[PDB]
Ligand binder design. Structure first.
Ligand SMILES: *[C@@H]1O[C@H](CO)[C@@H](O[C@@H]2O[C@H](CO)[C@@H](O[C@@H]3O[C@H](CO[C@H]4O[C@H](CO)[C@@H](O)[C@H](O)[C@@H]4O[C@@H]4O[C@H](CO)[C@@H](O)[C@H](O)[C@H]4NC(C)=O)[C@@H](O)[C@H](O[C@H]4O[C@H](CO)[C@@H](O)[C@H](O)[C@@H]4O[C@@H]4O[C@H](CO)[C@@H](O)[C@H](O)[C@H]4NC(C)=O)[C@@H]3O)[C@H](O)[C@H]2NC(C)=O)[C@H](O)[C@H]1NC(C)=O
Ligand SMILES: *[C@@H]1O[C@H](CO)[C@@H](O[C@@H]2O[C@H](CO)[C@@H](O[C@@H]3O[C@H](CO[C@H]4O[C@H](CO)[C@@H](O)[C@H](O)[C@@H]4O[C@@H]4O[C@H](CO)[C@@H](O[C@@H]5O[C@H](CO)[C@H](O)[C@H](O)[C@H]5O)[C@H](O)[C@H]4NC(C)=O)[C@@H](O)[C@H](O[C@H]4O[C@H](CO)[C@@H](O)[C@H](O)[C@@H]4O)[C@@H]3O)[C@H](O)[C@H]2NC(C)=O)[C@H](O)[C@H]1NC(C)=O
Ligand SMILES: CCCCCCCC/C=C/CCCCCCCC(=O)O[C@@H](COC(=O)CCCCCCCCCCCCCCC)COP(=O)([O-])OCC[N+](C)(C)C
Ligand SMILES: CCCCCCCC/C=C/CCCCCCCC(=O)O[C@@H](COC(=O)CCCCCCCCCCCCCCC)COP(=O)([O-])OCC[N+](C)(C)C
Ligand SMILES: CC(C)CCC[C@@H](C)[C@H]1CC[C@H]2[C@@H]3CC=C4C[C@@H](O)CC[C@]4(C)[C@H]3CC[C@]12C
Ligand SMILES: N[C@@H](CCC(=O)O)C(=O)O
Ligand SMILES: [Ca+2]
Ligand SMILES: [Ca+2]
Ligand SMILES: [Zn+2]
Ligand SMILES: [Zn+2]
Lengths: 237, 144, 144, 237, 48, 48, 48
C-alpha cells in the first residue's frame, strides 16, 4: 500500500470505520481511521473555500474549510512529517461516491510549498493556481474515472446525468510534478492549498466526501475504492 | 586496425542493420567496435546516412555503412573512399508481409530482370560514375 | 497496392520539377525504376507512400516491437517494401523477403589523405638546408 | 523537428551561421540564425545574473545578463509567441561544448508564469526557485550528458577531471511540468526566469555557450547538437 | 522441391551463419590454399 | 562465492559508459572475462 | 583458501581454456592495443 496522508472532507458518516456520526473534515496518517475530526456543516450546491497548511515553525498540520457566510473547521493535528511520508510525493485531489450520489466538482485549485534550500537563502517553490481547468489539461495525471473540461470545472465524478453523478464513481486528480519533503534540509515545507469545491445536492443525502492527499510518487485507485475507502485507501486500516 | 584507435571516431546509422550486426556479433574485433560504440552511443550513431556522409567531410570520423551507397558517394565526392574490404555480405530484398502471395511472384520478376541485364542497366544509370581520379596507380613513378 | 519506401540517395529521392507533383510523379531513383519494371511484369498498380516514422526498421527491445518499414509491413499497412531494406537474420523471422536485387557489404567511408605533391624544388630535399650552405661555404672556403 | 525557442548565451563566434564576430547574447526563434544580438563582456568564472521576460501586453522578449560591476545585455526582439511555439511546452536549460572547453555550471534557476483565465480571473502559475540543485532531484528530466549535485550546482557537462570540461559533450535540463501557452486563453503569461551561471575559463579561449530554451513537451538531443548547433537545434538554418 | 516445409527453416538458418561469420570461416577454410607466390617476388634480376 | 579482486589495468577496471552501472557489470578486463569463463564451465554465481 | 573444494575444479577448468585457446584469445583481446609505430618507419631522411 502506498503511503498517503489526506484531509477527508467526508460527506458521509462511516461508523464502522471510525468516522463520526456527523459529516466531518478529517485528517489521515496512512489510515481511513482519522486522527482528528471536527463538525462540518455540509451545505448544498454552494462553493468551496478550503485551505491546508503545515508550517514546521509550529509543526501543526492544519486544515480549514469555509463556505461564504459559514464558519471555519480548524482540525489541526500535530504530526511529525519527518518519518510518516516519503522524500518525494505527488500531491493531488481525490473524490468518490458509492450507493449514494453526490457531485464533487472542484473548480479551482492551488498549492505553494517552501522548503529550506538554506533557511533564509531563497527556498524552493511550486506555486500554481488552476482557475481554468481546460478540456485537455495535460499537467494533470487524473486517474480512475475522473473527468474534466466542458466548462471551467474539474469533475471528479462520472457526471452529466443531469448532475446525478452515476453512483459508485471515483476519480483522482494528481498533480504532475514531485515535491521534496522528508527532512534532509529540514522540514519547514509550508505547503499551502486552496480547494474551492462544489457539492451539489442530489436530493439523495449527498455522500461520500472529497479528499486532498499527499501520496507516493506512484499511485492508482487502490483495489476498488467506490465507497468508504474514499478514493485512496486499499483497506479500512 | 580501426577497432584499436580511439583517435578516429566511428559509429553507424541508428535503427539500422550496421549496428545491429555489431550488437549481435561475438567475434573479438567486431564486438570491440560495439564495446566502443555502446559507450558514446549518441555521439557517433548518426540519424541518417546523409549525416553519416557529412560528419566524415567535417570531422575525424570514419562511418560504417553499406558498399552500394559508398559506390554512389565516392563517384560523386572525390575526396572520400572505401577504407578496407567488405565486412560481410547482405542484400536488398523487396520486403513483403509474413505469408504473402507476392513473395514468389517478385522472386520470379527479379530473376527475369537479372538474366537480361535490366538490374545492371539500371545500376549503371543511377550510379553514373561521372569521372573521378581513381588512384595514383601505385607503380614505378616516371619523372614528369 | 500500397508500397512503403524511404528517402535514401540514390535509391528513392524526390524528382526535381517545378510543377505541383501528384501521387507517384514526385518520386525518381533506382528502386522506383525497379518497381516501374516489376509493375510491367506482374501487371499490378503500385502507389508509392513514404514510411511514417522515417526509420528503416529495428527492434526496440523494450516492448519488443518494431519501427520503420518493418513495422509498416507486420501491421499490413503497406503491401510492399521496395526500398534499400536489407536482408538480415532478425528481419526474416517476421516478414518475407524476395531474392536480392543487389548485393551489399558493410565497409568504412573515410576521407582520402591529401597527397601533397613533391613540388618542383624537390631535388634539394636529400640534403638539409644547412648542409647546402656548408657545401657552399666549403667551395667558397677550399677555393680560397 | 521540435519547435523550440531559446535565448542563446553563445560564446563561439560563428559568422558562418549568423552569430556575430564577438561572443554575444542571442535570441533564437526556431533557428540558430538568431533575431537580435548584443555585445557581451563575458567575464570568467563569476556570477551569472541573467533574466528573461515576455509580457504579451508589450510582446517583447527582453533579456539581460549581468555580472557584478558589469552592464546589461538588452537583446529585446519583438516576436509574438502566439503562432511560433506550441500549446503545451517544456522549459529548461541547454548547454554544450565541442572541440574546445568551457564550464557550464548553473548555480540557481527560477521561473514564474501568469496566464489569463479571463485576465483578472486569477491567472495561473508554475513558479519554482531551484537554488539548491541536489543529487537526486526527481522533478528534472536532465538529458544528454548533463549531471547534477556534488555541490549546490547544475553541472551541464561531463566534468571533474579537475573540472576540465571534456569537449564534445551536450547537456540539457528539461523541467518536468508543462506550461499552457499558445494564445487560446490569451498569452499574457509574462514568464520570468533567472539564469545564474558560472562560465569558468579553462585557459582554452573558451567557447560554446549556454542556452535557455522553451521546447515541445517531447524532445531529445537531436541527431547531434554538440557544437555550433548549441545543444538544441538539429539544423543550422 | 516445389513447396517445402524446409525452405524457410534453412532461409533463416543461412542468415544465422553469416551473422556469426561461419559462412566466412568456411569460405577461408577451403578456398584459401597455397599463397600462389606473386609476381612481385623478383629476388634477383641479372640484366640481359 | 565472494571474489576478492583489486583494480589493476588491464586485468580488472571499471566499465565506462553514460549511465552508471551497478554490481558485477561495473567491472571489465581480463580477469572479469576469465571469471565469466570459470562461471560458465563450472557453474556458480560470483560477487565482485 | 587453505584447502578448498574449488581449487581442483578451477585447475581442470583453466586447462580447458588454454586447450580451446580462449586464454590466448583473451590475451590478444586486452594486451593488443595500438601497434606502437616502429623504429623502422623512416619515410624521409634529409641528411643533416
Ligand atoms: C441478518 O439479516 C440481515 C438481513 O437484512 C443480513 O444481511 C445484511 O448483511 C450485510 C453484511 O453482509 C450488511 O449490510 C449492511 O446493511 C446496511 C443497512 O441496510 C440498509 O441498506 C441496505 C443495503 O445494504 C438496504 O438493503 C436496507 O433496506 C437499508 O437501506 C434502505 O435503503 C433505501 C434505499 O433506497 C432507503 O430508501 C431506506 O430508507 C433504507 N432503510 C433503512 C436505512 O432502514 C447498509 O447500509 C450497509 O451498507 C453500508 O455500505 C454502503 C457502501 O457505501 C453504503 O450503503 C453505506 O456506507 C452503508 O453504511 C451504513 O449505512 C447506514 C445507512 O443505510 C448507516 O447506518 C451508516 O452510514 C452505515 N452503517 C453503519 C453501521 O456504520 C450494509 O450493506 C448487514 O449486516 C445486513 N443488512 C441489513 C441488516 O440491512 C445479515 O447478514 C444477517 N446477520 C447478521 C449477523 O446481522
Ligand atoms: C587535406 O587538406 C586539408 C587542408 O585544409 C587538411 O585538413 C585540415 O586539417 C586541419 C587540422 O588542423 C583543419 O584545421 C583548421 O584549423 C584552423 C586553425 O585554427 C585552429 O582551429 C582549431 C582550434 O580552434 C585547431 O584544430 C587548429 O589546429 C588551430 O588551432 C591550434 O590548435 C592547437 C591544438 O588545440 C592549439 O594548441 C593549444 O590549443 C589551446 C586551445 O586552442 C590553446 O590555444 C593553447 O594555448 C594551445 O597550446 C594551437 O594553439 C591552435 N592554434 C591556433 C592559431 O588556434 C581553423 O580554421 C579550424 O578550426 C576552427 O574552425 C572550425 C570550423 O567549424 C570550428 O568549428 C573549430 O572549433 C575551430 O574554431 C580547423 O581546425 C582544416 O580545417 C582541415 N581542412 C579541411 C578542408 O578539412 C588535411 O590535413 C589534408 N589531408 C592530408 C594532408 O592527408
Ligand atoms: C652539390 C652542389 C652544391 C651547390 C652549392 C650551393 C647550394 C646553396 C643552396 C642553399 C639552400 C637552397 C635550398 C633551400 C632548402 C630546400 C628545402 C626547402 O624547404 O625549400 C623549399 C622552398 O623552395 C626554395 O625556396 C628552395 C630554394 C630556391 C633556390 C634554389 C637554387 C639552387 C641552388 C644553387 C645551385 C646553382 C649552381 C651551383 C654552383 C655552380 C623547397 O621545397 P618545396 O619543393 O618547395 O616544398 C614545398 C612544395 N609545396 C609548397 C607544394 C608543398
Ligand atoms: C670562408 C667561410 C665563409 C665566410 C662566412 C660568410 C657568411 C655566410 C654565412 C651564412 C649563414 C647561413 C644563413 C642562411 C641560412 C639559410 C637556410 C634556410 O633555412 O633558409 C632557406 C634557404 O633557401 C634559400 O632561399 C637559399 C637562397 C637561394 C639559393 C642560391 C644561393 C647560391 C646560388 C649559387 C652559388 C654559386 C656558387 C659560386 C662558387 C664560386 C631554406 O628555407 P626556405 O623554406 O626555402 O625559406 C624561404 C626564404 N625566402 C622566402 C626568402 C626565399
Ligand atoms: C672549411 C670550412 C669553411 C667548412 C665549413 C665550416 C666548418 C669548419 C664547420 C661549420 C659547422 C660545423 C659543424 C657544426 C656542428 C657540429 C656538431 C658537433 O656535434 C660536432 C661538430 C660539428 C659537426 C661541426 C663541424 C665543423 C663545421 C662543419
Ligand atoms: N539500409 C540498411 C540500414 C543501414 C545499414 O545497415 O548500413 C537497412 O535498411 O537495413
Ligand atoms: Ca468516509
Ligand atoms: Ca557558437
Ligand atoms: Zn470520514
Ligand atoms: Zn550564437
Amino acid at each position: 500500500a502506498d503511503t498517503i496522508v489526506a484531509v477527508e472532507l467526508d460527506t458521509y458518516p462511516n461508523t464502522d470505520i471510525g468516522d463520526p456520526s456527523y459529516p466531518h473534515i478529517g485528517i489521515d496518517i496512512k489510515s481511513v481511521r482519522s486522527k482528528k475530526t471536527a463538525k462540518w456543516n455540509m451545505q448544498n450546491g454552494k462553493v468551496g473555500t478550503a485551505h491546508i497548511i503545515y508550517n514546521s515553525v509550529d509543526k501543526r498540520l492544519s486544515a480549514v474549510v469555509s463556505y461564504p457566510n459559514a464558519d471555519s473547521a480548524t482540525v489541526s493535528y500535530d504530526v511529525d512529517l519527518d518519518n510518516v511520508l516519503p522524500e518525494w510525493v505527488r500531491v493531488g485531489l481525490s473524490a468518490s461516491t458509492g450507493l449514494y450520489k453526490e457531485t464533487n466538482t472542484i473548480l479551482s485549485w492551488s498549492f505553494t510549498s517552501k522548503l529550506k534550500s538554506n533557511s533564509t537563502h531563497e527556498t524552493n517553490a511550486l506555486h500554481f493556481m488552476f482557475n481554468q481547468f481546460s478540456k485537455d489539461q495535460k499537467d494533470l495525471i487524473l486517474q480512475g474515472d475522473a473527468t474534466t473540461g466542458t466548462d471551467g470545472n474539474l469533475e471528479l465524478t462520472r457526471v452529466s446525468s443531469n448532475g446525478s453523478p452515476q453512483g459508485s464513481s471515483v476519480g483522482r486528480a494528481l498533480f504532475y510534478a514531485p515535491v521534496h519533503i522528508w527532512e534532509s534540509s529540514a522540514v519547514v515545507a509550508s505547503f499551502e492549498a486552496t480547494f474551492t469545491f462544489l457539492i451539489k445536492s442530489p436530493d439523495s443525502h449527498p455522500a461520500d466526501g472529497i479528499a486532498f492527499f499527499i501520496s507516493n510518487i506512484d499511485s492508482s485507485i487502490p483495489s476498488g475504492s467506490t465507497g468508504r475507502l474514499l478514493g485512496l485507501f486499499p483497506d479500512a486500516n | 586496425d580501426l577497432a584499436k584507435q580511439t583517435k578516429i571516431e566511428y559509429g553507424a546509422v541508428e535503427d539500422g542493420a550496421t549496428m545491429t550486426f555489431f550488437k549481435k556479433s561475438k567475434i573479438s574485433t567486431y564486438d570491440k567496435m560495439w564495446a566502443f560504440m555502446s559507450s558514446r552511443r549518441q555521439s557517433v550513431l548518426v540519424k541518417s546516412n546523409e549525416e553519416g556522409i557529412q560528419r566524415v567531410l567535417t570531422s575525424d570520423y570514419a562511418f560504417l555503412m553499406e558498399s552500394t551507397t559508398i559506390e554512389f558517394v565516392t563517384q560523386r565526392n572525390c575526396n572520400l573512399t572505401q577504407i578496407g574490404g567488405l565486412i560481410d555480405s547482405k542484400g536488398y530484398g523487396v520486403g513483403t508481409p509474413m505469408g504473402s502471395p507476392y513473395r514468389d511472384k517478385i522472386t520470379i520478376a527479379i530473376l527475369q530482370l537479372q538474366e537480361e541485364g535490366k538490374l545492371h542497366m539500371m545500376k549503371e544509370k543511377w550510379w553514373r560514375g561521372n569521372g573521378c581520379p581513381e588512384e595514383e596507380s601505385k607503380e614505378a613513378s616516371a619523372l614528369g | 497496392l500500397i508500397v512503403t519506401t524511404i528517402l535514401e540517395e540514390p535509391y528513392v529521392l524526390f524528382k526535381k520539377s517545378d510543377k505541383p507533383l501528384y501521387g507517384n510523379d514526385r518520386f525518381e531513383g533506382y528502386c522506383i525504376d525497379l518497381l516501374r519494371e516489376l509493375s510491367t511484369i506482374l501487371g499490378f498498380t503500385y502507389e508509392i507512400r513514404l514510411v511514417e516514422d522515417g526509420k528503416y526498421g529495428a527492434q526496440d527491445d523494450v516492448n519488443g516491437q518494431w519501427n520503420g518499414m518493418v513495422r509498416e509491413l507486420i501491421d499490413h499497412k503497406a503491401d510492399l517494401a521496395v526500398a534499400p531494406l536489407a536482408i538480415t537474420y532478425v528481419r526474416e523471422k517476421v516478414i518475407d523477403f524476395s531474392k536480392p536485387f543487389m548485393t551489399l557489404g558493410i565497409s568504412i567511408l573515410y576521407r582520402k589523405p591529401n597527397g601533397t605533391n613533391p613540388g618542383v624544388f624537390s631535388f634539394l630535399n636529400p640534403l638539409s638546408p644547412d648542409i647546402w650552405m656548408y657545401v657552399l661555404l666549403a667551395c667558397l672556403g677550399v677555393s680560397c
